[PDB]
Design a protein around this ligand. Structure first.
Ligand SMILES: NC(=S)Cn1cnc(Cl)c1Cl
Length: 282
């Protein structure tokens, strides 16, 4: 079926939970043996969210190459994303090592450091120009260059330096600051505006390594971001945009990381975002 009318048909019939459970039943299951080794317990935020072995990002380190991160490679859309968890106190250095080694231009953050009165990820970037951060385990230096605070999101320019080679690179930090503590946003308008700002920066483009995207577990909000982006790109590329099937795209992405889209409300919100974004395109 088309998307917008499939949408109203699920709303009128109130069957979002049944649609979402079908997705969960059909989703791929692949091994995640490296993630479950005992030496990696303090590298995982949640025991039930792990990268598959076949698609995990490897650190270029011979001691321990493990990080909770997955490469999502979308062949028809010609887009790649790295989806990861919010860094932990003992993985902030690994996180920036990955950004460096994978040649990423942008980092997309969809959570606040504290939500619901608890810490959802480490404070992994510097908050003042004159107070830079040094990650001694991976030999990197990170400096805040500039910061632009808007009503729904903040963009930061950062300088990452590889202290071994003295090479430097500019990283853009796109921070969506207004996702609610419970539920999903009422309108997708500010999320779509944010997606378009990331696109405009070049961070999603083939001349760079894959964008790094995260929330707390790296599957819920993060899944919504890449699912909406890929669906809109396919609607631009194809002769028949109504052939784009969001449930099929989601199942393809779930071949690369488990659990993408965590609730039936996130699924409905993803439909809403794609439906509204397609118009604005023309
Ligand atoms: N009809 C479409 S959108 C084909 N398809 C299904 N899943 C993905 Cl990804 C693609 Cl492409």
């Amino acid at each position: 079926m088309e998307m917008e009318k499939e949408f109203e048909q699920i709303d009128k019939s109130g069957s979002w939970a049944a649609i979402y459970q079908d997705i969960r039943h059909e989703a791929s299951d692949f091994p995640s043996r490296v993630a479950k080794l005992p030496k990696n317990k303090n590298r995982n935020r949640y025991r039930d969210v792990s990268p598959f072995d076949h698609s995990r990002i490897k650190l270029h380190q011979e001691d321990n190459d493990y990080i909770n991160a997955s490469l999502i490679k979308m062949e028809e859309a010609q887009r790649s994303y790295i989806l990861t968890q919010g860094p932990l106190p003992n993985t902030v250095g690994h996180f920036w090592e990955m950004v460096w080694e994978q040649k990423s231009r942008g980092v997309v953050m969809l959570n606040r450091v504290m939500e619901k009165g608890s810490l959802k990820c480490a404070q992994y970037w510097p908050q003042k120009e004159e107070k830079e951060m040094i990650f001694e385990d991976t030999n990197l230096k990170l400096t805040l260059i500039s910061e632009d605070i808007k009503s729904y999101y903040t963009v930061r320019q950062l300088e990452l330096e590889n202290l071994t080679t003295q090479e430097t690179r500019e990283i853009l930090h796109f921070h969506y600051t207004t996702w609610p503590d419970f539920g999903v946003p009422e309108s997708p308008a500010s999320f779509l505006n944010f997606l378009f700002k990331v696109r405009e920066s070049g961070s999603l483009s083939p001349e760079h390594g894959p964008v790094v995207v995260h929330c707390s577990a790296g599957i819920g909000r993060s899944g919504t971001f890449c699912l909406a982006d890929t669906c809109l790109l396919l609607m631009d590329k194809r002769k028949d945009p109504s052939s784009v099937d969001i449930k099929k795209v989601l199942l393809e992405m779930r071949k690369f990381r488990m659990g993408l889209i965590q609730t039936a409300d996130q699924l409905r919100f993803s439909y809403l975002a794609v439906i509204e974004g397609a118009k604005f395109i023309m």
